[PDB]
């Protein structure tokens, strides 16, 4: 080990050499010979400095002695070897394992770096590196390691970082006509983090024509499978990114114009590995009111003929793919629920037609699913009553923390899909089609379930609905939904 004073010296040496080199570079610009040694030193000491990351306790030392500010000046150094060695150091310094060791050290340095506008300085650095040169491609990888490290410790900076030119770089890097590459995979991972719960970055993606990018890149896997598990993990990151963007009502319009629906559709038809995610996207593209135009387009392009088969039978591939029956059933019903919510006109009619062909077979299915999930809910709830009874025996007050455990168990049992199924039933029964009401009541009353149980599930659904959006919205939906009970 080394000591505070043995560290202060090492830094003061850096500053020494940093300064020296800057001067000689400015004073002897034509002649590598006069400054080169100065450089090799800066390089060596910059490297030696890595050891500082071992003791994150002494991080005020790097800010105090002005080491952090010059170190950024270095990212712009006219030779890549210095610039990349800086990045190396920034990666080691900023490694999350390290940043958790001492709060103070972490806290002070991040502030220095934000102050520095590091993300814009790293991006200027990226714009000059050439991935054809191996040591520079590793530089891209390492700068990307940093933003990840920094976002893991402090998410709020991602907004600033993205705007600071990063998002644009990523988009151009994913587009670029270059063979698939570990840096490409990493770009994909880093992009999706930038968007995680971040409307500001999701919109900025929109404005940059991000969606087109995601759709060309995703369209590589429409008919053919991806070669490798790395290249398959990228695809999945692209989808992740894509769904995240669709969380914002403004991107639904951009998706549509990008012929996004057609792609996800084509994916479903070709039944490749993309199919599970493509179904998820469709779901995100249609979910609430901001789904409306997309719903209508879905039908226009024949989405109905693609989705209902998947409503009737859940895919064989389930043991191999990773998406479970439950998940798959969750999305389809989600999608139908959005279709029933938002469709009007010809398209609505065509949808309702699917419930009448042939002897209302889809109604039977719907009700098959009703019982499946209802049943699971009843066990889940019974178990919960039991546990509450056992808490009282044992003297344990139930609290919100308990309630949250309980909620999660219901979520795992199929609460959401159950809610959707019942919404669908109710909407179906309010299309003034006697055939369809009959089948529901027929089916419902003879067996062990009842209108009463369904009505109840709807109310709960209404009550907790629109958790997402605005106080006036939550009022309006709740109203509309509860209106479906009048003729049911």
Author numbering: 76 to 563
Which passages does the manuscript contain on this structure?
CTNNBL1 is a spliceosome-associated protein that binds nuclear localization signals (NLSs) in splice factors CDC5L and Prp31 as well as the antibody diversifying enzyme AID. CTNNBL1 is a widely expressed, highly conserved 62 kDa nuclear protein that associates with components of the RNA splicing machinery. CTNNBL1 comprises a HEAT-like domain (including a nuclear export signal), a central armadillo domain, and a coiled-coil C-terminal domain. Our results identify CTNNBL1 as a unique selective NLS-binding protein with striking differences from karyopherin-αs.
We crystallized full-length human 6xHis-CTNNBL1 and N-terminally truncated 6xHis-CTNNBL1Δ76 (to generate a fragment that is necessary and sufficient for NLS-peptide binding). We were unable to solve the structure using molecular replacement and therefore crystallized selenomethionine-substituted protein for experimental phase determination, solving the structures of CTNNBL1Δ76 and that of full-length CTNNBL1 from crystals with the symmetry of different spacegroups. The overall structure of CTNNBL1Δ76 reveals a superhelical coiled coil composed of α-helices stacked against each other to form an extended configuration, in agreement with circular dichroism data. The structure can be divided into three distinct regions: an N-terminal pre-armadillo (PRE-ARM) domain (residues 76–176); a central compact armadillo (ARM) domain with helices tightly packed against one another to form a solenoid (residues 177–416); and a C-terminal domain (CTD) that projects out from the smooth solenoid of the ARM domain (residues 417–562). As in HEAT repeats, the CTNNBL1Δ76 PRE-ARM helices also contain conserved hydrophobic residues in the buried interaction surface of the helices where they mediate intra- and inter-repeat packing. In order to probe the NLS binding mode of CTNNBL1, we generated multiple mutants of CTNNBL1Δ76 based on the crystal structure. Strikingly, all mutants retained the ability to interact with the CDC5L NLS3 as judged by a pulldown assay. Thus, CTNNBL1 likely recognizes NLS ligands in a manner very different from karyopherin-α.
